[PDB]
Design a protein around this ligand. Structure first.
Ligand SMILES: [Mg+2]
Ligand SMILES: [Mg+2]
Ligand SMILES: [Mg+2]
Ligand SMILES: [Mg+2]
Ligand SMILES: [Mg+2]
Lengths: 153, 129, 258, 170, 165
RNA sequence: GCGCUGCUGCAGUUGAAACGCCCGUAGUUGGCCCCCCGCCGCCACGAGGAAACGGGAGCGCUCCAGGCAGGCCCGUUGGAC
């Protein structure tokens, strides 16, 4: 928590040294691929997909079984969202802030938070416009953000 | 943020040797660190070391034996001419008889004595004595 | 900006290889236009007064020249500022002295005495081929001379032998790998060697790599590479064979002569 | 057949240019004698082109194009001589001209460090090339073509979309 | 097209009661025992990997004289980019030397997963790599460590030694 | 002199001096990894381009500040670099 704050914790995850599957693994590389397919059809983000796989199916890491990551699989199958997930969630949070604010506009901390969130959105959007992951025309506007949320979701 | 890995390594080494320690651990590994340590070892300042692989940010262990009195880096790599080494030697080193100055050249990483022998110049990395 | 051409020459602004004393005077002779340019020539008076020493002043040289006592390429010249250049014939019949003007290893003009058999010609470098009036082929050289109707086999940068009495070409040496040459410009004036390599760059200079008899190798641009035969010189050359000694050996020679 | 098609397009274009009465003058290639266009056979060439000569190749657009430009280095009457340079496109607003940005380094001895400097150089752009901002161009030196122009474009390499501006010495 | 391949192929034809090999390489060891390396083509390494411990045991039991190891043959390219003059061709990272050596090391002891690697830099001795194996398995592999070191040195000039931790 | 203008090489709790705080564009700076191909910087060598001044080889203007002289039996006497 460093970019827009003063904190500095170190809560992370530490993956294992060895990349091989579990000795009790009973899934061919395909079987998961169908599971990813049906989960995605239900509008599940990849992070939740990994959570579901790890908890319900006992798969610590997808890459160790299939050799590839979830989003790459979805793209090969033509199911990955056009808008990346982190950006989409940031835009959700911005919309929620704006709504709460237009209900009542005497709250200044909320405006502070909104400023921070929009700055982060602009930075990430610029990075994605570079690297050709988004159209050059893509631009974020405060007054039309809900529309993009609805269509791009 | 972290920038100069070598500076951190050298500061840690000097800190440990000050209180007469026997082993050190420096976190990020690099080719330049390895060559610096190899030269130090060939000159007889730091004995042996080992590199530990973890896929990311390989760690290193070094064994100390006193002897070392100072070590450092010059952050902006200046381009020393072949005939401009004496001034830097005088400015940086305690004497013209036992210190070592490290340079990076098109012929590789070597000492200032070796570069004087081959009458070539290059860029400066650091020093120890 | 001067309103016209320049007629004077300060002594300090003169070429170094003329070897003129700083305290001789404010002025130095200004060579007149002719076969050779200002920086690739030396005035006649300098040879006749400061070297051979047959005269001690400007006036004596003037009398000697206007009395017709020196022939340049078979023609008497009365101009004290006439320019003398490379591979020129200097004959003084009154004393039976004949010299050919060449370069020493140090990079200065020297007089190599010659014989009667080889004084009826000179070597010229051809550097320009062009069409003149009526489309007639022509050919020019380093000494400001033009010859009409040259052989088609003669190309640029070649070397040409012409009889002094009659400006007619006899034989020609091609510019090719393996031919003895002599350097006439730059840091390597007076060195003699054989061509080993030729490298051209589109739109820029062409560099020639030469090797001396002793194995030394040196480079220079093609604008001052002169061919002097086919593996062996065609004319008599100085006592030394185009070998430049290092400072140490020159100092040893100086001490020996001391 | 291939040759016959080319002459038709070249022959055809000269007649629309004659039907563009809004223009005040008739623009034609100097080298070509106007008169070959009434020859039904294809035994006389209708377009003039040349080679730059520094290892560069003449674009197909120039050879098969139907434009007139006296300052073009391929179909015109100018010659390339001198220095060849590289740069990036900074602006492309004039009719047939662009502004090229050149980047280089300057060393300061007292501080033993460098400074980044840039210059703007204007050039003529022939209709045979398509250029947008950020593209890389090779320019060749020519005679004075105007008050600020002494260079002509001879090669274009495209640059991708939304690519970040970067300091690019060349 | 050599003797060893003939009898090993006959063996393989006996074992079933679909997969073929590329070549066979034999490496010597300090003892009279040697090692035979079988170069499996890349697309079928996993085909020869599922039940290969039995395969190697049976092969050793048929023709004794040297142990058998199964590895894949991978290519190494010597340029990150290739300049055809017009565009650039990028070398895939899988064709680097560092990746290939690591894959070889994993393949030599495929049934047992490596737990760590370390390279030591002695004062005078040439630098050498030492790897770390699971402490559970030992007597199974204690008797085939010299052969592993020899084959790794032969394929890759880098030297090594083995311990358990 | 002066490390009292500080690149080498100052100072910034109390002596003079850290913006009240945050966001942020130009600008500056950016972890680790591929053994060799192309490009930029970098190092070395070289060509090319006036001397005078400065450095510097040799020479007893009686010494010297200087000058390029000079000796007979002179590198082709010299003025190298
Ligand atoms: Mg920040
Ligand atoms: Mg932290
Ligand atoms: Mg002070
Ligand atoms: Mg106070
Ligand atoms: Mg105060």
């Amino acid at each position: 928590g460093r970019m827009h704050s003063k904190g500095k914790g170190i809560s992370r995850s530490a993956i294992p040294y060895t990349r091989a599957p579990a000795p009790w693994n009973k899934y061919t590389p395909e079987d998961v691929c169908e599971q990813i397919c049906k989960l995605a059809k239900k509008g599940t983000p990849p992070s939740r997909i990994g959570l579901i796989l790890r908890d319900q199916f006992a798969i610590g890491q997808v890459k160790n079984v299939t050799g590839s990551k979830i989003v790459r699989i979805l793209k090969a199958k033509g199911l990955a969202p056009e808008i990346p997930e982190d950006l989409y969630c940031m835009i959700k949070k911005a919309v929620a802030i704006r709504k709460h604010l237009e209900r009542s506009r005497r709250d200044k901390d909320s405006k502070f938070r909104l400023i921070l969130v929009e700055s982060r959105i602009h930075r990430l959007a610029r990075y994605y416009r570079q690297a050709r992951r988004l159209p050059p025309t893509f631009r974020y506007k405060s007054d039309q953000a809900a529309a993009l949320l609805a269509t791009y979701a | 943020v972290r920038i100069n890995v070598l500076r951190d390594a050298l500061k840690s080494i000097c800190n440990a040797q000050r209180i007469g320690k026997k082993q050190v651990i420096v976190r990020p590994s690099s080719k330049v660190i390895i060559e610096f340590l190899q030269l130090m070892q060939k000159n007889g300042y730091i004995s042996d070391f080992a590199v530990v692989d973890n896929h990311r940010s390989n760690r290193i262990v070094v064994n100390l034996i006193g002897r070392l009195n100072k070590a450092g880096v010059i952050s902006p790599r200046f381009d020393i001419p072949a005939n401009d080494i004496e001034k830097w030697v005088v400015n940086l080193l305690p004497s013209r008889l036992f210190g070592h100055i490290i340079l990076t050249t098109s012929q590789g990483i070597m000492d200032h004595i070796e570069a004087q022998h081959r009458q070539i110049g290059g860029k400066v990395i650091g020093y120890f004595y | 900006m001067a309103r016209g051409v320049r007629k004077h020459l300060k002594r300090l602004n003169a070429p170094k290889h003329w070897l003129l004393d700083k305290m001789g005077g404010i002025w130095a002779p200004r060579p007149t236009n002719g076969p050779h340019g200002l920086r690739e020539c030396i005035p006649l008076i300098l040879i006749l007064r400061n070297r051979l020493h047959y005269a001690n002043t400007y006036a004596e040289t003037s009398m000697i020249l206007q009395d017709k006592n020196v022939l340049i390429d078979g023609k008497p010249r009365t101009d004290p500022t006439f320019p003398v250049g490379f591979m020129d014939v200097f004959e003084i019949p009154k004393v039976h002295k004949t010299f050919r003007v060449l370069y020493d290893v140090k990079g200065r003009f020297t007089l190599v005495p010659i014989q009667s058999n080889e004084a009826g010609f000179k070597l010229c470098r051809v550097q320009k081929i062009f069409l003149g009036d009526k489309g007639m082929p022509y050919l020019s050289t380093h000494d400001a001379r033009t010859i009409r109707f040259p052989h088609p086999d003669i190309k640029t940068n070649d070397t040409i032998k012409i009889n002094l009495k009659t400006g007619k070409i006899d034989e020609w040496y091609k510019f090719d790998i393996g031919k003895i040459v002599m350097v006439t410009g730059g840091r390597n004036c007076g060195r003699i060697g054989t061509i080993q390599a030729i490298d051209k760059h589109m739109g820029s200079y062409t560099m020639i790599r030469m090797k001396d008899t002793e194995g030394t190798e040196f480079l220079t641009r093609l604008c001052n590479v002169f061919v002097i035969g086919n593996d062996s010189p065609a004319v008599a050359i100085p006592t030394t064979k185009g070998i430049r000694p290092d400072i140490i050996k020159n100092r040893e020679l100086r001490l020996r002569s001391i | 057949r291939r040759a016959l098609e080319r002459a038709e397009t070249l022959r055809k274009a000269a007649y629309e240019m004659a039907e563009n009465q809004h223009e005040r003058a008739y623009h034609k290639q100097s080298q070509i004698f106007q008169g070959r266009f009434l020859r039904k056979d294809n035994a006389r060439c209708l377009r003039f082109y040349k080679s730059i000569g520094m290892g560069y190749h003449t674009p197909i657009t120039a050879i098969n194009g139907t434009y007139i430009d006296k300052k073009c280095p391929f179909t015109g009457n100018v010659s390339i001589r001198g220095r060849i340079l590289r740069g990036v496109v900074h602006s492309a607003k004039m009719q047939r001209s662009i502004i090229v940005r050149r980047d280089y380094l300057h060393f300061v001895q007292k501080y033993k460090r460098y400074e980044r400097r840039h210059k703007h150089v204007a050039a003529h752009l022939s209709p045979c090339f398509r250029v947008k901002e950020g593209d890389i161009v090779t320019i060749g030196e020519c005679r004075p073509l105007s008050k600020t122009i002494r260079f002509n474009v001879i090669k274009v390499e495209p640059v991708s979309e939304a690519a970040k501006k970067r300091f690019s010495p060349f | 097209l050599s003797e060893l391949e003939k009898q090993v192929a006959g063996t393989l034809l006996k074992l079933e009661d679909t997969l073929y090999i590329s070549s066979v390489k034999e490496i010597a060891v300090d003892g009279d025992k040697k090692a035979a390396v079988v170069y499996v083509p890349y697309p079928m390494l996993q085909s020869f990997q599922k039940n290969s411990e039995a395969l190697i045991l049976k092969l050793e039991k048929n023709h004794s004289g040297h142990r058998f190891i199964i590895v894949a043959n991978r290519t190494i390219m010597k340029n990150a980019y290739v300049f055809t003059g017009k565009k650039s061709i990028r070398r895939p990272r899988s064709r680097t030397m560092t990746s290939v050596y690591n894959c070889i090391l994993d393949d030599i002891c495929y049934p047992i997963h490596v737990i760590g690697k370390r390279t030591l830099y002695p004062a005078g001795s040439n630098p050498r790599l030492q790897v770390v194996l699971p402490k559970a398995v030992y007597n199974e592999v204690s008797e085939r460590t010299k052969t592993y070191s020899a084959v790794y040195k032969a394929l890759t000039e880098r030297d090594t030694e083995f311990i358990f931790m």
